[PDB]
C-alpha cells in the first residue's frame, strides 16, 4: 500500500515542479508604477431594520432595487433599496436557515437550512400570496449556499463532501460531484455559467465543470478553513477568504497564487468576499466588527467601513456597482454607497 | 409629493411591519434549551414525556422548547455557531462508565473555552447514579486504575459512594471554574435514572440565569 502513496507523492512533486517552472514574476512586483487610489470614504446611505434576529444571507438579484435577506427569526424578507419598504415577508417551515438566493428571472426565491431540505418559493402567482413551490430533499447534511443557473436548474453545496446540481420539475439530483474530503462552505457561478468554484474546510478550492461532472483544477493554501469565495469579472481569477487573517487571489489559467492580503495586527477571520464592477475593490468582511477594503492590484489597504456591533455575515455588491449591502448578527442591514 | 401607488405601498409596508412585530412578540414566551450528551448516556429520559428532535413542556406557566441535533456528521465546529442565543446548554454525561468518562471531560472543556457560546451557562447532569453505588460496593473494579489522583483524595449512604460522587463532580467543577469568570457557571444537580423532578430544577436554573443576565445588563451589578 506504500507504493500507491509513493506514486501520489511523486505526482505531487512533479506538479509542484511544473508550477515553479511556470512561474516567472509575481503580480505584486510588476505593478509598481500604478498610482494607488486615494482614501475611500463611504457613509451609511440607508439602514433597514425590524428583523429581531441575526442576518445570515442576502442576495440582490439581476435588478439593482430588490433585495432578499434571511435570518434565524424564521422570516425571509424582501426589501426595496430606494425607499426602504417591504414587499414580502415569507414565513419558513424550519427556523434555522443558512442561505438564500434570488433567481435571475425575478420569479423564484430559494432558502436553505440546518435541515437537508432546500425550499423553493414562488413569487408571481394568481392568488397573490407566496406559497412553497418545491422542496428538494435527500442530501444528508446542512446546506451552505444555493445558486440559480436558470429557472429550471439549481446548484447546491452542503455540509457533507458533495456538491449537487438538481432539477426543479423532476426533483431528482441531475448530477453530483464528490470530493473535498470535508465540509463545503462556499459557492459562486462564473459569468460563463459553465464552470463554478467551490471552497472546502479542507483548505481547498476546486473548479468544477457543470457540463461534464468532474473536477478539473484544485488550489491549496490558507493553512486553515475556507468560508468565502468570489469570482473576478474577467472570469479567469477568483478570491478566497479564510479563517486566518489572509485573503488570497488565485489565477485560473495558471494554477498559481498571485497575491495575499493580511496585516500584522489582524487576528480575526474572514466571513464574506465580493469584488466590484471594475474589479478593483475586493471588499471583505471580518470576524471583528469592522470591514476592510483592499486595492486588488496593489496590496495596500485603502479605507474602512464603520461596520455593525456583532459581526459581518454577508457582503454584496450590486450588479450596477453603485451600492454595497452589509448584513450583521444584529438585525440591522446597511446599504453603503 | 408622492403618487397614490407609493402611498399605498407605504401603508402596506406599515401593516407588514405591525404584523411582523406582533408575531415576533410571541418569541419571548418560549425559552430555548439545547441538549448535548453521549450515546450511551440517556438523553431522552432526563425529562419525562439531518433531523432535529424537539421537546416541548410547560412548567408553572412557562414554556420550554428543547432541541437535540442528530443525523449530522462528527465534525461539529461549524453548525454549532447557530446556537448562539439559546438560554442554556443542558449537558448529560454518564457517571457509571469510567473508561469513556475521560472523553466526556473534553466535551466539557472545548465547549467552555469556545470563542462563541462563551456567555451560555451549562446545566450539568449525572445520569445512572444508581449503578454507581452498585459498582462502588463491588470491588471488582476501582476508579484508581484510570484516575491516579483518587488514591490520596479525601472527603472535603456509605462514605465510599459519597466520596466517589464528590470526586466525579469536582472533576467537572474544576474545569468549569478554571477558565470562565463572571459570565457563566455550571450546575451538577446529581440526577438519577428515574427521577421525576428534573423539570423543576431546569426551571429554577433558568430563572437564576435570567435574573443574573438582567442584573448584569441593567448595570445594577
Amino acid at each position, epitope marked *: 500500500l506504500d507504493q500507491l502513496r509513493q506514486e501520489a507523492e511523486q505526482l505531487k512533486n512533479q506538479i509542484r515542479d511544473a508550477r515553479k517552472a511556470c512561474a516567472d514574476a509575481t503580480l505584486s512586483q510588476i505593478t509598481n508604477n500604478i498610482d494607488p487610489v486615494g482614501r475611500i470614504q463611504m457613509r451609511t446611505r440607508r439602514t433597514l431594520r425590524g428583523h429581531l434576529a441575526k442576518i445570515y444571507a442576502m442576495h440582490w438579484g439581476t435588478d439593482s*432595487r*430588490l433585495l432578499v435577506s434571511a435570518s434565524q427569526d424564521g422570516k425571509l424578507i424582501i426589501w*426595496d433599496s430606494y425607499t426602504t*419598504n417591504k*414587499v414580502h415577508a415569507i414565513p419558513l417551515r424550519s427556523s434555522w436557515v443558512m442561505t438564500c438566493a434570488y433567481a435571475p428571472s425575478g420569479n423564484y426565491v430559494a432558502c436553505g437550512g440546518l435541515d437537508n431540505i432546500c425550499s423553493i418559493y414562488n413569487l408571481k402567482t*394568481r*392568488e*397573490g*400570496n407566496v406559497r412553497v413551490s418545491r422542496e428538494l430533499a435527500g442530501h444528508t447534511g446542512y446546506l451552505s449556499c444555493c445558486r440559480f443557473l436558470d429557472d429550471n436548474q439549481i446548484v447546491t453545496s452542503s455540509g457533507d463532501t458533495t456538491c449537487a446540481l438538481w432539477d426543479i420539475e423532476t426533483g431528482q439530483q441531475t448530477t453530483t460531484f464528490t470530493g473535498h474530503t470535508g465540509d463545503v462552505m462556499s459557492l459562486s457561478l462564473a459569468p460563463d455559467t459553465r464552470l463554478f468554484v467551490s471552497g472546502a474546510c479542507d483548505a481547498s478550492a476546486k473548479l468544477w465543470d457543470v457540463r461534464e461532472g468532474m473536477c478539473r483544477q484544485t488550489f491549496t493554501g490558507h493553512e486553515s478553513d475556507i468560508n468565502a469565495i468570489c469570482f473576478f469579472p474577467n472570469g479567469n481569477a477568483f478570491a478566497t477568504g479564510s479563517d486566518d487573517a489572509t485573503c488570497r487571489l488565485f489565477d485560473l489559467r495558471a494554477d498559481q497564487e498571485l497575491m495575499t492580503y493580511s496585516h500584522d495586527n489582524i487576528i480575526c477571520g474572514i466571513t464574506s468576499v465580493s469584488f466590484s464592477k471594475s474589479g478593483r475593490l475586493l471588499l471583505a468582511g471580518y470576524d471583528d466588527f469592522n470591514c476592510n477594503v483592499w486595492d486588488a492590484l496593489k496590496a495596500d489597504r485603502a479605507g474602512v467601513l464603520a461596520g455593525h456591533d456583532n459581526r459581518v455575515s454577508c457582503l454584496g455588491v450590486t450588479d450596477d456597482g453603485m451600492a454595497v449591502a452589509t448584513g450583521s448578527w444584529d438585525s440591522f442591514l446597511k446599504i453603503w454607497n | 409629493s408622492v*403618487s*397614490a*401607488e*407609493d402611498k*399605498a*405601498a407605504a*401603508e*402596506r409596508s406599515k*401593516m407588514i411591519d405591525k404584523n411582523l412585530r406582533e408575531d415576533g412578540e410571541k418569541a419571548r414566551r418560549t425559552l430555548r434549551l439545547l441538549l448535548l450528551g453521549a450515546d450511551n448516556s440517556g438523553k431522552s429520559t432526563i425529562v419525562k414525556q439531518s433531523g432535529i428532535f424537539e421537546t416541548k413542556f410547560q412548567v408553572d406557566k412557562v414554556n420550554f422548547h428543547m432541541f437535540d441535533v442528530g443525523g449530522q456528521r462528527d465534525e461539529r465546529r461549524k453548525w454549532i455557531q447557530c446556537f448562539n442565543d439559546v438560554t442554556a446548554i443542558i449537558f448529560v454525561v454518564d457517571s457509571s462508565d469510567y473508561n469513556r468518562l475521560q472523553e466526556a471531560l473534553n466535551d466539557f472543556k472545548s465547549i467552555w473555552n469556545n470563542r462563541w457560546l462563551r456567555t451560555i451557562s451549562v446545566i450539568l447532569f449525572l445520569n445512572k447514579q444508581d449503578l454507581l453505588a452498585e459498582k462502588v460496593l463491588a470491588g471488582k473494579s476501582k476508579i484508581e486504575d484510570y484516575f491516579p489522583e483518587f488514591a490520596r483524595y479525601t472527603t472535603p449512604e456509605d462514605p465510599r459512594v459519597t466520596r466517589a460522587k464528590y470526586f466525579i463532580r469536582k472533576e467537572f467543577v474544576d474545569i468549569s471554574t478554571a477558565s470562565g469568570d463572571g459570565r457563566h457557571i455550571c450546575y451538577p444537580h446529581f440526577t438519577c435514572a428515574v427521577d421525576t423532578e428534573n423539570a423543576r430544577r431546569i426551571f429554577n436554573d433558568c430563572k437564576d440565569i435570567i435574573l443574573q443576565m438582567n442584573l448584569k445588563e441593567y448595570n445594577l451589578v
Partner: single-chain antibody
Amino acid sequence: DVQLVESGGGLVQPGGSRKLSCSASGFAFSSFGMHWVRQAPEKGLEWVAYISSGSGTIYYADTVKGRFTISRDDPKNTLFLQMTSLRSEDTAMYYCVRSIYYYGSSPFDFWGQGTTLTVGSDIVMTQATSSVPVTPGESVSISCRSSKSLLHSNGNTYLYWFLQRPGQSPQLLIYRMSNLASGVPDRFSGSGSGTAFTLTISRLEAEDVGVYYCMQHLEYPLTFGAGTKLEL
C-alpha cells in the same frame, strides 16, 4: 379560479335606499384593496368608490360624497356598499374590481360580472370617440391625449388601457406603458411621450372587436376615457 359574484339588483323608487354585496372566493381577500366602478347605459366608465386594505384610507367621488358608504369584511370575505338618498340619475351597472399595490404589481386585474340598478380640477382624459373601421390582417392604432403630463419624477407614467367585448366584463390589457398583463398575446403594444399615448394592434384577429378605454392614476379622482369602438 378567481370568483367574484355580486348581488343586490332590482329597481329603486327615488329617495329610497339599498345595499349591494360583492363576494370573493379563490384568492387571499385580506391583502387586496378593492374598488367599485359604475357604468351608465351607453356611456363610459365612472369611478364611484374605494376601500383600502385594513380600512386605512377611504376615498370617494365629489359627485357622490355624503350619500354612500363602503365597508369590507375579511372574515366573511364580503364587500358591502350601502346607498342612501338615491337620485334619478344613479341608474347604471356596477362592477367589483380588485387591485394590489406594491413594486412591480398590477392593479385592476379581475373584474366582476356586474349588477344592474334602474330607477373642476380633474383630468380630461379625452380621446376621439369616432368608430375606426377594421379588417382582419392589418394593424391599427388608437390615440389618447391628456391635459397634465403623466410622467412623474419616479419615471413611471400612470396610464392604463382597458378592453371591453360586446358581452363580457372589461379586462386589463396594458398597465402603465409597454407592460402587458399575463394571458394576453404579444400583438398589443403601447408607446408615446409624456402627454400623448398610442396603443398599436398588429395582426388583427376576429375576437379583438370591442371598445377601448384610456385611464390615468396620478390624481386620485380617476377619470376613464370616452372609449373607441372597433367594428367590422
